[PDB]
Amino acid sequence: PRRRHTHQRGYLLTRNPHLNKDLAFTLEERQQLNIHGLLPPSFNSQEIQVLRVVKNFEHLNSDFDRYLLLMDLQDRNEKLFYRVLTSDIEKFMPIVYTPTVGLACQQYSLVFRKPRGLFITIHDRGHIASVLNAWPEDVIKAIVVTDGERILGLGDLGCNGMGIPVGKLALYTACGGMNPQECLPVILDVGTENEELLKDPLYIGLRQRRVRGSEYDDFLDEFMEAVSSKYGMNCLIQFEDFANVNAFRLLNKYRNQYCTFNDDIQGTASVAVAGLLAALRITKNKLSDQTILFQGAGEAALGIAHLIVMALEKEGLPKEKAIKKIWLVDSKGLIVKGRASLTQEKEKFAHEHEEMKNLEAIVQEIKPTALIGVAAIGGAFSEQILKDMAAFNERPIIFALSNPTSKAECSAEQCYKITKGRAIFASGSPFDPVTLPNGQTLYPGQGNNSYVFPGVALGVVACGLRQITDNIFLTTAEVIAQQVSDKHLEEGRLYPPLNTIRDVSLKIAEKIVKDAYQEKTATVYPEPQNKEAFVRSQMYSTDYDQILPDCYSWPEEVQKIQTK
Amino acid sequence: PRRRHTHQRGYLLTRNPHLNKDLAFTLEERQQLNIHGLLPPSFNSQEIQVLRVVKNFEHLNSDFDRYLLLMDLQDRNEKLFYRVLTSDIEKFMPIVYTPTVGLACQQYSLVFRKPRGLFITIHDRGHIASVLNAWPEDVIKAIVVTDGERILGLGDLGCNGMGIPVGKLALYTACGGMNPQECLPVILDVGTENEELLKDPLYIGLRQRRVRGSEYDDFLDEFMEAVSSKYGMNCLIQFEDFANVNAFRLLNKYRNQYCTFNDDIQGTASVAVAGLLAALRITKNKLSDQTILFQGAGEAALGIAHLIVMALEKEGLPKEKAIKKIWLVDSKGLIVKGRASLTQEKEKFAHEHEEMKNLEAIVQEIKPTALIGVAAIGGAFSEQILKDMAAFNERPIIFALSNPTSKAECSAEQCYKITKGRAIFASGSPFDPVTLPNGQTLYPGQGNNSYVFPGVALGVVACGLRQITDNIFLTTAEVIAQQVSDKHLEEGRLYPPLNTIRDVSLKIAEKIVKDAYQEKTATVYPEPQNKEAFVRSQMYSTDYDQILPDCYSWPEEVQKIQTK
Amino acid sequence: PRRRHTHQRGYLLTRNPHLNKDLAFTLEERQQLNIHGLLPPSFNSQEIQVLRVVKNFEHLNSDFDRYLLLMDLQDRNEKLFYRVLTSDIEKFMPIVYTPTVGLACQQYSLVFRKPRGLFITIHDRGHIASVLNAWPEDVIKAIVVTDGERILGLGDLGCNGMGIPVGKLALYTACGGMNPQECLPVILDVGTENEELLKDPLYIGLRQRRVRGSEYDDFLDEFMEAVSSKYGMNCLIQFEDFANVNAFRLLNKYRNQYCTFNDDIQGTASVAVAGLLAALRITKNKLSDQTILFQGAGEAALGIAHLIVMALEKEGLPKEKAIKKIWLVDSKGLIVKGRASLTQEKEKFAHEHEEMKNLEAIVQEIKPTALIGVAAIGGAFSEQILKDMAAFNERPIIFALSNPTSKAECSAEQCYKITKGRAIFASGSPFDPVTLPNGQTLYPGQGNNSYVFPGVALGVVACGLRQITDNIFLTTAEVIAQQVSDKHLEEGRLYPPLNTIRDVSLKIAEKIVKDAYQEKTATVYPEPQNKEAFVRSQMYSTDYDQILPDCYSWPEEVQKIQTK
Ligand SMILES: NC(=O)C1=CN([C@@H]2O[C@H](COP(=O)(O)OP(=O)(O)OC[C@H]3O[C@@H](n4cnc5c(N)ncnc54)[C@H](OP(=O)(O)O)[C@@H]3O)[C@@H](O)[C@H]2O)C=CC1
Ligand SMILES: NC(=O)C1=CN([C@@H]2O[C@H](COP(=O)(O)OP(=O)(O)OC[C@H]3O[C@@H](n4cnc5c(N)ncnc54)[C@H](OP(=O)(O)O)[C@@H]3O)[C@@H](O)[C@H]2O)C=CC1
Ligand SMILES: NC(=O)C1=CN([C@@H]2O[C@H](COP(=O)(O)OP(=O)(O)OC[C@H]3O[C@@H](n4cnc5c(N)ncnc54)[C@H](OP(=O)(O)O)[C@@H]3O)[C@@H](O)[C@H]2O)C=CC1
Ligand SMILES: CCCc1nc2c(C)ccn(Cc3ccc4nc(-c5ccccc5-c5nnn[nH]5)sc4c3)c-2n1
Ligand SMILES: CCCc1nc2c(C)ccn(Cc3ccc4nc(-c5ccccc5-c5nnn[nH]5)sc4c3)c-2n1
Ligand SMILES: CCCc1nc2c(C)ccn(Cc3ccc4nc(-c5ccccc5-c5nnn[nH]5)sc4c3)c-2n1
Ligand SMILES: [Mn+2]
Ligand SMILES: [Mn+2]
Ligand SMILES: [Mn+2]
């Protein structure tokens, strides 16, 4: 076990969730820590503590009640919290993170009990350094920050968006083995445009409209200098759930000077491309053979498209040819050269072509090999679309990435039925196994951002990468695809099973670290002989640290009290 | 507003439920206490915090879940918790104490989250002093202690008994203004006979049978010494939920040397007598004039009868006259001279008489003016009993004290119906108002122990009474009955409204204090001018304290930084 | 030994002079306290520690430097400091207190290093309570307070007077076994009249003239309130080195409400009367037989005289007759009826007699059997006066109480020479033993206040006396006199030896405690069986406490970590 000799003693030690073991404290520990008597007189193994929590967990009636229970656990005993989470990652992920964390953010102001994370507001402009000073952990290696302007599919929840950094960093630890004590969740509160919350007597945020323009920009600037100043330039800064206009803009602004990335853009890209790469092992052809059609042309679609182009360039195809293989549809229709209401980023994919408004006709005209839904329009992949995709393609790739199930472009059932079982399918939300007439059962997987971010962070932090290139995300996509077995593919899965996420994260971190030492981008020296064991050594374990003083004798002659 | 200049700062301050205000911390408070940023950017008044708690409380689906919410609150923000309680004492008391705390204790080992109170076990024999060292508050004035052998009406729940001292002390504070910071809930774990808990892998207590005999006696001896030695002879020690045999033995053992009482014995006698005294103002005669028949002859019965005799003596009746006014019935029947299976204590009321077993006949024979049910046999005041009571008496006094209502000697509805509205009625457990055919509504009250202990503690402590005589309990009964208005009595109520209990507690303490100075038994000096103001000044307020450093300038001449 | 279980650990523990043992911490203590490595790797017994300190002490070149060394010691290791002191009380007393402390106070502003004691200024008026909150010890039982207006014979030293309360409390502990952690030295800074300090750039106090009048009076009132309110009414409050009018005035004002005394007045009275009482065992006659002449009629003379009168009334003489036995001489000369410049307090001894201004003739006129010098006029007991005293008395009682040596009414040498060895002599400042012409040596002792205050404080606090009557001082004088052996009296010693002082203090306290239970004035209950052992148990030892957690096992069955 890890040794960490605490100077804390008495009641206040029990109040630190990194020190507190509850009933797992032995008699010897309790007496030595001066807490003997503050706990009932029984001694639990971690397995006994897990049993208690699960029994409670099962007696609860909603996902929300389940979330509240686990969050109470997080704030009492960090190690037990992660022991529970990792005892069944597939069960607990959807409780502490999406989709449930969604309801928690809607209900954040109502249920606000024990705070988690650092709140920095626009009125602390010029004073961010001293806001940081309140955080009780000096050594921080990963930050997740939101301004709450675009939480999941729920829009502007302002300060209620604190649930996202908190639950995200939970997964950083549970999935990727980041040390939670080195993790810092942040919300930047500049106001909200959410009208209910402005009216709500219980709202915990700044009761004002969002501050915009160059004052916003200068506040974000200060946030970046203060954090990197205090925690070092190797501290990872991950943005989440910013508005569309800020997300790309800020990533572009900072990415070259700070150790930062944005999961809504780059993580989404990685995991989508990972699913494509896996699907290629079914179609048995190259990426350069594909024609990609995106329904949607937002953060998801443009991030994904950017990374596909990069994979195509890696395969040898020049950029301006790569781009021609990708078509976009937005709310105004197909993106083509000279259309009204194009942006500069949309314009890169504006190929010469007749304007088209209707998706079914777009499909019939473009005849994609791969059709990616990222528009949040439920049912968009209609019978005709699916019929057409199966007409044009042996094994049509169809990704219904919109979340949750209700917004999904089609179900697994509809996809497999209408394509007579030939579609290669993945989705944003889980769908049950589907059994086809011929008696095969298909297990369509989910392109979960959780395959990507935990291992990327671990990797980056472990070797001290100073910038996170888009190449890290391409390389990661390859690693993920690599973990899918032929048997998985023939089962219809494009992703490794969820329960292996801890292993996926390790392999992702391993590859990043090997690469950084290879190409001299690593900053942590001396270079480790064994990259595998080096990364493992940097992972947080759910086993309790020993915290007692190191006790040991000296030889009799020199240990004894001198008198005469 | 009260002061409290803490040295605590930063994260650990927020972990102290005595310092922590959560959102009620002003911006100046947060910045000054080095916690600015650990909380979301809104500043809430205490009422706004109350609304948040109450909205939460409301959406819960059981009293148990409501208990868990309030207990979580207690352990995060002690003032807010007490503000919640006192905002509707009649609504909250059944949730934090009886009957909900009963389920809490049953379930304590399953739902155990953060500890409250001090656990002292048989195996700490010889070390109790050092166990006391773990308690983080040095200044303790009130202790509630249990061995969990006889929790409410649920029997032996061993270490799970800890719910009782915690809930009991919450009522000390909420109902009587005892400072929670100065209160110590204690469980002595000597084992349990509870077979279910002994089998239960989750049980938090010692997994062994109860230690008996001298080993136990020596342990309690050391308990009393350690506690009074550390907290001083002025510190109140209240026994609760001991086995009846022990309860009486231990009170007898310690009452003359320590500041100790037993609420199951003495508080019960006090509140029953209080009801009787109130009833005398409807019957419009003397306690002297009554013939009392007790259904039951156990801890409740013998305690109440003892105090009745003392009230009779005080009226001017000699003991041996007093005594003949009280008859008891046990499981074997009427207590009569020379009957079998009698004890020394039941002997005091063994009058010369034919043995009888049937309560209806006993009733027809004794013809009491007052029938007091304390047998825990539901339905024992039958139709015939009620009929006879109302034929023998204009206004028959009928107390159905057995708890909960399902064990009550009769319901209020039956009592009022069969006595044709003539019975003066009180119960142990709440009954609904009853409306007579003449359109008058009667509101039978409850002889809630909560009318007695909060005020008695406040009194004993405020004036430094070294011992708690039985006369304290006679006095307290008189004070309670005196708070009942003629209007209340006309409404069938024998007790002051539960929502006034703060006031009732103050008046009880006023009287104890006034008495103590008068007959020179107080130990706090100098003697206060105005005894109401003095007691008032000893009571804990739910208002937040100010804990900011005291800041004030000096004249500039002597404040200047000297130079040369 | 004694146990004090601290939650302190690591560096800061070593900064607490009550926890810090330096090299006397064992290896196991160091490891357990998280300080192993902060000390060099040798383990010293207390005696080795004492040897180091004493070696340094003897290499220094002045008493002043010795003072600075021991004061540095007091501020790093309290137990070792007091071990050193007590190892040779006669040697160390004059270093930490008079006369060396006088130089310390004159130099206090220059040599100021680490603070000791609490500074409270007139500018803190209204805020005294909050000043008290800075003191890190909540349990306070003895306070010594000065305004620094009359320090020793060095007049007004303002804030530089802090040396007096500090040094005085050291003697409380060293001499009387008061717990130093329970003692609080205070200076009240209302300004100074000292022109050299007012002019000095380094002066540490308020650079202003003294606030007089009701502003002063109101300040002192708040002080008594705040201190009694925070520490309780049993907290001892000893006034020291106030101006003369203030001292009496303040003593009269508060003595009836507060547990307070003034050592300059009452301590002085007690020790001088102890000396007288001792001398009566040489002259083998009664106090009522004496004719007493005071050279001086200030604080010392009037307090001694008042206590003599009390002792005379105790022997059986009405006050009006006892008064006749005492003659005062002031700077205007013999005090008599009608005289100009008489305060109403001198009026108490203004007998019918003609004015006289020459001491020599006052002597030859009064023919006193005892002559007491408290006028601060060096050499006033001239050869002629001494010749007369020996002519008029077989054994003249002669007290040269003025301080220091240079202000003595006569030296031991001169007194013994001129009275040809028959004078019964004691002084305020120490003289060497004197070898007479017959070759016998006499050992005049010192009427040192140290004989009185440590034992008074011990007794008062031990039994919880709420006021300190003058009778305490009379009883105390008797006790000290009883400690002088006949053999000592034959050597010319009026006082028990300085190296037995702790025993004398024990005896003084025993008597106070016996008397207080005897006449029901004690407030600590229950009454101890054995008053001797009770006072002993209250005395601070110079032995180190054990501070390690109390560790002890439970039977293996219950101590076992529980699994499934
Ligand atoms: N790993 C995963 O499962 C992930 C899934 N997603 C899913 O992708 C979806 C979109 O996310 P994101 O890109 O961040 O959102 P954005 O809001 O950035 O983009 C939404 C895009 O949809 C376009 N659009 C809206 N209506 C239509 C329509 N009727 N037909 C065609 N296009 C339309 C918008 O058009 P315009 O440009 O005209 O406004 C915009 O281009 C969500 O459902 C989300 O759940 C996202 C990230 C990850
Ligand atoms: N403030 C309140 O409202 C309070 C109410 N109570 C209630 O009073 C009831 C008794 O509690 P407590 O005195 O502590 O309990 P005990 O067990 O000490 O006393 C019970 C008594 O009932 C007797 N009894 C049992 N069966 C019968 C029967 N068929 N006929 C007559 N007597 C019978 C027992 O007889 P034997 O001695 O032969 O066994 C015993 O004397 C409980 O229901 C409790 O809820 C108690 C305290 C306070
Ligand atoms: N235990 C001990 O050893 C103690 C010794 N002392 C010593 O006693 C001395 C006086 O102390 P204290 O009473 O506090 O001082 P005060 O200043 O209160 O008293 C001084 C007294 O001496 C008088 N005086 C001054 N000059 C003469 C003179 N020429 N002839 C006669 N009387 C004169 C003053 O007279 P007037 O009233 O006219 O001003 C005044 O009455 C100091 O030297 C002090 O060291 C004091 C306390 C304890
Ligand atoms: C791992 C691959 C990630 C990646 N690296 C990239 C580089 C270097 C360059 C370009 N992209 C594409 C990209 C990625 C995301 C994105 N969201 C946008 C957006 C979305 C909605 C609304 C407005 C805007 C908006 N419009 N204009 N500004 N903001 S536009 C946009 C472009 C990249 N993607
Ligand atoms: C406010 C007045 C309270 C009060 N002061 C009292 C004094 C001084 C003396 C006597 N009583 C009566 C009293 C009070 C309670 C009690 N429980 C008992 C008991 C209960 C159950 C089972 C066995 C026993 C049992 N049987 N024999 N021993 N234990 S017996 C018993 C007597 C008093 N009540
Ligand atoms: C153990 C005996 C204690 C004791 N109890 C006493 C009681 C109750 C009453 C009187 N004395 C005598 C006493 C004791 C000290 C003292 N200093 C004074 C003083 C000295 C110098 C200058 C002005 C004043 C001054 N003049 N007027 N006010 N201040 S006058 C004075 C009287 C007492 N001594
Ligand atoms: Mn997101
Ligand atoms: Mn009870
Ligand atoms: Mn002095």
Q: Can you tell me the distance from the alpha carbon of B283 to that of B395, in angstroms, rounded to the nearest whole number?
A: 6
For residue C257, how far is its CA from the centre of ligand 6 (angstroms)?
Answer: 18
- CATH architecture entry for A11-265: 3-Layer(aba) Sandwich (3.40)
Among A14, A27, A45, A552, the residue to mutate for chain C (most C Cβ within 10 A): A27
Of A497, A426, A508, the closest CA to residue A462 belongs to: A508
Q: Strand A260-262 vs strand B326-330: parallel, antiparallel, or unpaired? A: unpaired
Catalytic annotation, pick one of C168, C346, C507, C531: C168
Nearest CA to ligand 1 atom 39: A331
Q: Can you tell me the distance from the alpha carbon of C36 to that of A29, in angstroms, rounded to the nearest whole number?
A: 19
Is the CB of residue B481 less than 8 Å from the CB of residue B274?
yes
Is the CB of residue B458 less than 8 Å from the CB of residue B508?
yes
How would you write B510-545 as a 3-class SS string?
A: HHHHHHHHHCCCCCCCCCCCCHHHHHHHCCCCCCCC
Q: Helix, strand, coil shares of chain B as percentages rounded to 5?
A: 50, 10, 40
Q: How many CB atoms lie within 10 A of CB B553?
A: 7
Torsion angle defined by CA atoms of residues A152, A157, A160 and A163, in that order, rounded to the nearest 10 degrees? 10
Is the N-terminal amide bond of A433 cis, ω within 30° of 0? no
- B500 CB contacts (<8 Å, ≥6 apart)? B483
For residue C159, the distance in angstroms to the closest alpha carbon of chain A comes to: 38
Record: contact B37-A159, CB cut-off 8 A: no
Chain C residues in contact with chain A using a Cβ-Cβ cutoff of 8 Å = 5, 7-10, 24, 26-28, 31-34, 36, 41-45, 47-48, 549-554, 558-564
Is the CB of residue C24 less than 8 Å from the CB of residue C46?
yes
Is the CB of residue B431 less than 8 Å from the CB of residue B151?
no
DSSP A297-319: -SHHHHHHHHHHHHHHHHTT--H
* SS3 category, B336: strand
**Nearest by CB: C208 against B201, B466, B558:** B558
> Measured from the CB, is residue C29 less than 6 Å from ligand 6?
no
Q: How many CB atoms lie within 10 A of CB C464?
A: 18
User: How large is the C-alpha radius of gyration of chain B?
Assistant: 25
Q: Can you tell me the distance from the alpha carbon of A510 to that of A463, in angstroms, rounded to the nearest whole number?
A: 10
Q: Can you tell me the distance from the alpha carbon of B220 to that of B237, in angstroms, rounded to the nearest whole number?
A: 12
**Dihedral sign computed on CA atoms, order A80, A85, A88, A91:** positive
DSSP B274-286: HHHHHHHHHHTS-
Is the CB of residue B337 less than 8 Å from the CB of residue B322?
no
- A70 CB contacts (<8 Å, ≥6 apart)? A57, A81, A84, A85, A92, A95, A96
The answer to whether residue B416 is catalytic is no
A31 — phi, psi (to 5°)? -70, -35
Residue type, C230: K
Which regions of A396-528 does DSSP assign to beta strands (E)? 397-400, 424-427, 434-435, 441-442, 445-446
Beta-carbon-side half-sphere exposure of residue A271 (alpha carbons within 13 Å): 28
To one decimal, the resolution in angstroms is 2.1
For residue C375, how far is its CA from the centre of ligand 3 (angstroms)?
Answer: 3
Q: Can you tell me the distance from the alpha carbon of C522 to that of B99, in angstroms, rounded to the nearest whole number?
A: 47
Count Cβ atoms within 10 A of the Cβ of residue B421 and give its class: 0-12 exposed, 13-18 middle, 19 or more buried.
Answer: middle
Torsion angle defined by CA atoms of residues A558, A560, A563 and A564, in that order, rounded to the nearest 10 degrees? -70
Q: Can you tell me the distance from the alpha carbon of B206 to that of B222, in angstroms, rounded to the nearest whole number?
A: 19
Binding residues of C, by number, are: 150, 240-241, 264, 296-313, 403
Is the CB of residue A372 less than 8 Å from the CB of residue A304?
yes
For residue A171, the distance in angstroms to the closest alpha carbon of chain B comes to: 22
Q: How many CB atoms lie within 10 A of CB A417?
A: 17
Is the CB of residue A195 less than 8 Å from the CB of residue A143?
no
Q: Can you tell me the distance from the alpha carbon of B176 to that of B454, in angstroms, rounded to the nearest whole number?
A: 4
Q: Can you tell me the distance from the alpha carbon of C524 to that of B466, in angstroms, rounded to the nearest whole number?
A: 12
* SS3 category, C184: strand
For residue A559, the distance in angstroms to the closest alpha carbon of chain B comes to: 28
| Alpha-helix runs per DSSP H in A232-298 | 244-254, 268-283
Q: Can you tell me the distance from the alpha carbon of A524 to that of A527, in angstroms, rounded to the nearest whole number?
A: 7
For residue A168, how far is its CA from the centre of ligand 7 (angstroms)?
Answer: 9
Measured at the CA of C82, the angle between CA C79 and CA C87, to 5 degrees, comes to 125
Which regions of B310-466 does DSSP assign to beta strands (E)? 326-330, 333-334, 370-373, 397-400, 424-427, 434-435, 441-442, 445-446
Nearest CA to ligand 5 atom 8: B470
Residue with tokens 């130093």, as numbered in its chain: C180
For residue B452, how far is its CA from the centre of ligand 2 (angstroms)?
Answer: 20
Q: What is the DSSP letter of A410?
A: S
How would you write A358-395 as a 3-class SS string?
A: CHHHHHHHHCCCEEEECCCCCCCCCHHHHHHHHHHCCC
Is the CB of residue C476 less than 8 Å from the CB of residue C456?
yes
Question: What do you get for the CA distance between the two ends of chain B, in Å?
Answer: 43
Record: contact A47-C7, CB cut-off 8 A: no
Tokens of C81: 């400091």
Tokens of B413: 């509805």
DSSP B245-258: HHHHHHHHHHTTTS
Element (H, E) at A185: strand A183-189
Residue with tokens 């209700």, as numbered in its chain: A406
Q: Can you tell me the distance from the alpha carbon of C436 to that of C417, in angstroms, rounded to the nearest whole number?
A: 7
Residue with tokens 């005071």, as numbered in its chain: C294
* SS3 category, B303: helix
Q: Can you tell me the distance from the alpha carbon of B507 to that of B451, in angstroms, rounded to the nearest whole number?
A: 11
Count Cβ atoms within 10 A of the Cβ of residue C115 and give its class: 0-12 exposed, 13-18 middle, 19 or more buried.
Answer: exposed
* SS3 category, C418: helix
Q: Is B237 left (phi over 0), alpha (psi -120 to 50) or beta?
A: beta
Q: Buried (b) or exposed (e) across B42-66, using 16+ Cβ within 10 A?
A: bebebeebbebbeebbeeeeeebbb
- Dmax (CA) for chain B in angstroms is 106
Record: contact A41-B110, CB cut-off 8 A: no
Catalytic annotation, pick one of A82, A97, A203, A540: A97
Chain B residues within an 8 Å CB radius of A56: 110-111
Q: Can you tell me the distance from the alpha carbon of B235 to that of B255, in angstroms, rounded to the nearest whole number?
A: 13
Method: X-ray
Element (H, E) at A322: helix A319-323
**Dihedral sign computed on CA atoms, order B463, B469, B470, B474:** negative
Beta-carbon-side half-sphere exposure of residue C198 (alpha carbons within 13 Å): 9
Integer angstrom CA distances of residue B425 from A145, A562, B358, B410, B433: 64, 80, 23, 10, 11
Q: Strand B333-334 vs strand B326-330: parallel, antiparallel, or unpaired? A: antiparallel
Among A15, A72, A109, the residue to mutate for chain B (most B Cβ within 10 A): A15
**Dihedral sign computed on CA atoms, order C332, C333, C338, C344:** positive
The answer to whether residue B97 is catalytic is yes
Torsion angle defined by CA atoms of residues B175, B179, B182 and B188, in that order, rounded to the nearest 10 degrees? 20
- B174 CB contacts (<8 Å, ≥6 apart)? B82, B85, B86, B89, B92, B93, B96
Chain B residues within an 8 Å CB radius of A161: none
Ligand 5: residue of B302, B347, B449, B460 to mutate (most ligand atoms within 8 A of CB) is B302
Measured at the CA of B500, the angle between CA B401 and CA B271, to 5 degrees, comes to 30
- Dmax (CA) for chain C in angstroms is 105
Of C332, C338, C313, the closest CA to residue C324 belongs to: C313
Q: Can you tell me the distance from the alpha carbon of C550 to that of C527, in angstroms, rounded to the nearest whole number?
A: 30
Q: What is the DSSP letter of C515?
A: H
Q: Can you tell me the distance from the alpha carbon of C518 to that of C382, in angstroms, rounded to the nearest whole number?
A: 48
DSSP C240-294: -S--HHHHHHHHHHHTTTSSEEEIIIIIHHHHHHHHHHHHHHHHTS-GGG--EEE
> Measured from the CB, is residue B343 less than 6 Å from ligand 5?
yes
- State the count of interchain CB pairs (< 8 A) between A and C: 73
Among A21, A32, A562, the residue to mutate for chain C (most C Cβ within 10 A): A562
Neighbours of chain B (3+ CB pairs under 8 A): A, C
Is the CB of residue B462 less than 8 Å from the CB of residue B434?
no
- B373 CB contacts (<8 Å, ≥6 apart)? B295, B296, B380, B381, B398, B399, B400, B401, B402, B408, B409, B410
For residue A181, how far is its CA from the centre of ligand 7 (angstroms)?
Answer: 23
Q: Can you tell me the distance from the alpha carbon of C457 to that of A258, in angstroms, rounded to the nearest whole number?
A: 68
Q: Can you tell me the distance from the alpha carbon of B209 to that of B199, in angstroms, rounded to the nearest whole number?
A: 12
Chain C residues within an 8 Å CB radius of B123: 554-555, 558
Q: Can you tell me the distance from the alpha carbon of C301 to that of C308, in angstroms, rounded to the nearest whole number?
A: 10
> Measured from the CB, is residue B307 less than 6 Å from ligand 5?
yes
* SS3 category, B393: coil
Integer angstrom CA distances of residue A461 from A171, A241, A546: 16, 22, 25
